[PDB]
Amino acid sequence: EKELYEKWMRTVEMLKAEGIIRSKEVERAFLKYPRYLSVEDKYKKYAHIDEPLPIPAGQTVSAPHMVAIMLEIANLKPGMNILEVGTGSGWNAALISEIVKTDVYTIERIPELVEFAKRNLERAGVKNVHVILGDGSKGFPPKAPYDVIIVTAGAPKIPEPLIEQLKIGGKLIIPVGSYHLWQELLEVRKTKDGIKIKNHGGVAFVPLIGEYGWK
Numbered sequence: 001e002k003e004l005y006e007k008w009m010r011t012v013e014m015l016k017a018e019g020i021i022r023s024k025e026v027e028r029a030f031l032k033y034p035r036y037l038s039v040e041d042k043y044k045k046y047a048h049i050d051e052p053l054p055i056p057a058g059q060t061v062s063a064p065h066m067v068a069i070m071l072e073i074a075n076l077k078p079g080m081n082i083l084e085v086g087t088g089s090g091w092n093a094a095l096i097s098e099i100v101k102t103d104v105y106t107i108e109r110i111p112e113l114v115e116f117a118k119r120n121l122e123r124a125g126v127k128n129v130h131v132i133l134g135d136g137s138k139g140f141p142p143k144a145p146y147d148v149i150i151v152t153a154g155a156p157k158i159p160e161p162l163i164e165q166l167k168i169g170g171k172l173i174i175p176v177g178s179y180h181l182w183q184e185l186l187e188v189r190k191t192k193d194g195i196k197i198k199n200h201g202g203v204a205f206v207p208l209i210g211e212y213g214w215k
């Protein structure tokens with residue numbers, strides 16, 4: 001337990017040593033919410049390994065380095081208004097909430113995982129993460145617009161609702177590819193001069209299933 005945390009500190013140290021965690025905000029978030037808080041008991045022994053792990057309903061919690069990479073691209077600041085698409089275990093939303101110090105909205109399409117994530121967040125003492133059941137390829141209009149939208153399921157294209165719900169100046173981080181399971185990680189900046197995309201290399205996420213995702 002203390003032992004699980006000691007193994008996690010080694011993971012965080014490694015991620016910093018390797019240049020993956022590059023900011024004190026992401027380091028501190030990782031140290032506050034170790035991944036073992038977000039997985040079922042049988043997987044806690046591997047939560048410190050930099051690999052994806054199963055969660056219920058056939059989904060996965062992402063590998064620690066991928067979560068770190070996406071948080072560092074997001075360049076999160078206190079008071080930002082963030083939407084996560086694909087809550088899963090709730091781990092990434094917990095981390096986002098530790099950096100932004102305010103309400104975080106996260107949407108999940110599978111009821112079993114809405115419940116799993118809510119239980120994990122509560123047990124960990126988190127209050128500012130708000131998990132919503134629904135189709136996050138439609139975003140979440142009630143709290144739009146957002147500073148950053150972080151999508152943790154792969155889409156066939158950039159969903160227009162997620163561009164419409166970004167503040168000008170904001171960014172969308174999303175895996176896109178013509179395979180359901182194999183994508184390119186895109187950073188989509190809605191800038192005053194138009195959409196600017198930085199392609200951040202190959203990734204493997206579960207599919208984004210919904211009206212503006214995969215059927």
Ligand SMILES: Nc1ncnc2c1ncn2[C@@H]1O[C@H](CSCC[C@H](N)C(=O)O)[C@@H](O)[C@H]1O
Pocket residue numbers: 038059060061062085086087088089090091092093107108109110113134135136137152153206207208209210213
């Ligand atoms: N249209 C949709 N809206 C919301 N969630 C979706 C979605 N399509 C797929 N998902 C969900 O995206 C999730 C990605 S899970 C990735 C890990 C997650 N961010 C965590 O911190 O654990 C899966 O649970 C999947 O059910």
